[PDB]
């Protein structure tokens, strides 16, 4: 079929979904697209190059809030940033597996510098906004891979039985289980950034 | 070599330091041993039982922190905890991708339902207490999943050249690489515990 990259991503998108990160293959890439590995490699020459790609074409098509709106609060930003950011992972299986293979690609420098920039605009150091950037980031990807790996792990092999299970951890595990730990992100996300307020606030006060 | 549980996990902790999670087979742990693949497999049936093990075995080891001290604050034990956490994590090559393949175990479940129980009696709901150990875990694993899949893309491939890196995300680059991510995670761990706190006192107020 087409080879050009965008049909490439399409394809191996597609994979990623059928197989996870640890399954795909450019093997099977070159038997999605009914080519022979040797063409593959014309366009795609390993695995870690195609991942590199995926990361960077998963955030272009689908996290829709890397910019804030004219006149945003950082906090605002931050918030949908970070909410946009974790649909984003979480819409391909390993989708967070497959963002940690990689730093911002040149293709998002313009964005990240800009990220940047706000956050400075907005009263923080560079060390100060990056700190805050980071942490968000981390507390989102940690989240996701947690729910990710969670389903990896089960479709082999089934979770233990609550004959031993005490009882707040069984009550726990069926509330981190009432939805797709979207309360626990939501709740988390609101405590992270206040606290980032009141750290800004303070400015050289002892707090 | 000795086959007893405690043997097999030295060797497959010394075999993940070698090869890392992706690479690491139960093929590459009896060529390690000295053994046949039909004897490993009476010991250990496949890959996903191992990583199981492991994640369990690598916090019993080297995670020292689990357990709040007597009269210790909730704020205090989170940090502590964190940081113990944290070191855990970043001892064996691909840790937090090892921890994240499951949820507690049998053998943790003692332990855990503590650490939860413990957030209950220090004023929280379990469902509040439990969003708040989330929120450390997960931020926790993505600051180390970050700086550990950074080691695992650089040894395939060079960073971008800074002849287009805009000035804002060089720093920053240059910041996040000036120890190993130390920083930024405490900065960002004391933001979260803050946060937590004035949610925890703000009781029914509108906050
Ligand atoms: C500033 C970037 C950065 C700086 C230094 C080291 C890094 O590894 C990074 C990133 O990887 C970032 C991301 O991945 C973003 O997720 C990122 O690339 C991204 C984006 N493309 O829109 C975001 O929305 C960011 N968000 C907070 C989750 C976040 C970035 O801000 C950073
Ligand atoms: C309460 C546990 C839990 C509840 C519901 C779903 C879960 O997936 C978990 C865990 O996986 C926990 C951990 O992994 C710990 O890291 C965990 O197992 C652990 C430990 N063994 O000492 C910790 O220190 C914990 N710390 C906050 C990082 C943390 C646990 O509190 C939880
Ligand atoms: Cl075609
Ligand atoms: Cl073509
Ligand atoms: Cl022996
Ligand atoms: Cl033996
Ligand atoms: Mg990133
Ligand atoms: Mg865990």
């Keep these: 079929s087409?080879?050009?990259?965008?049909?490439?991503?399409?394809?191996?998108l597609e994979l990623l979904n059928e197989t996870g990160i640890d399954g795909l293959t450019?093997?099977?890439?070159?038997?999605?697209?009914g080519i022979?590995?040797?063409?593959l490699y014309w366009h795609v020459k390993n695995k870690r190059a195609l991942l590199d790609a995926l990361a960077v074409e998963i955030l272009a098509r689908h996290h829709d809030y890397s910019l804030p709106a004219a006149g945003?609060?950082?906090?605002?930003?931050?918030?949908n940033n970070?909410?946009?950011?974790?649909?984003?992972?979480?819409?391909?299986?390993d989708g967070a597996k497959v963002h940690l293979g990689a730093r911002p690609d040149e293709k998002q420098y313009d964005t990240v510098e800009t990220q940047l920039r706000f956050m400075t605009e907005n009263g923080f150091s560079l060390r100060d906004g990056l700190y805050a950037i980071s942490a968000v980031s981390h507390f989102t990807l940690g989240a996701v891979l947690e729910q990710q790996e969670?389903?990896?792990?089960l479709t082999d092999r089934p979770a233990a039985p609550?004959?031993?299970?005490?009882?707040?951890?069984?009550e726990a595990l069926q509330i981190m289980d009432s939805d797709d730990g979207e309360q626990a992100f939501l709740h988390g996300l609101e405590?992270?950034?206040?606290?980032?307020?009141?750290?800004?606030?303070?400015?050289?006060?002892?707090?």
């Excluded at 450019?26 to 697209?33: D, E, G, S």
């Excluded at 405590?191 to 707090?207: C, D, H, K, M, N």
Aim: glycine share 2%; net charge positive.
């Design 2 to 12: 087409r080879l050009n990259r965008e049909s490439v991503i399409d394809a191996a």
């Design 26 to 33: 450019t093997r099977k890439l070159a038997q999605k697209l």
């Design 36 to 39: 022979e590995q040797p063409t």
């Design 72 to 79: 945003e609060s950082w906090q605002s930003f931050l918030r």
């Design 82 to 93: 970070a909410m946009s950011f974790r649909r984003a992972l979480l819409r391909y299986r």
């Design 150 to 153: 969670h389903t990896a792990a």
């Design 162 to 170: 609550d004959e031993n299970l005490p009882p707040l951890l069984r």
């Design 191 to 207: 405590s992270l950034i206040r606290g980032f307020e009141v750290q800004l606030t303070a400015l050289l006060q002892i707090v």
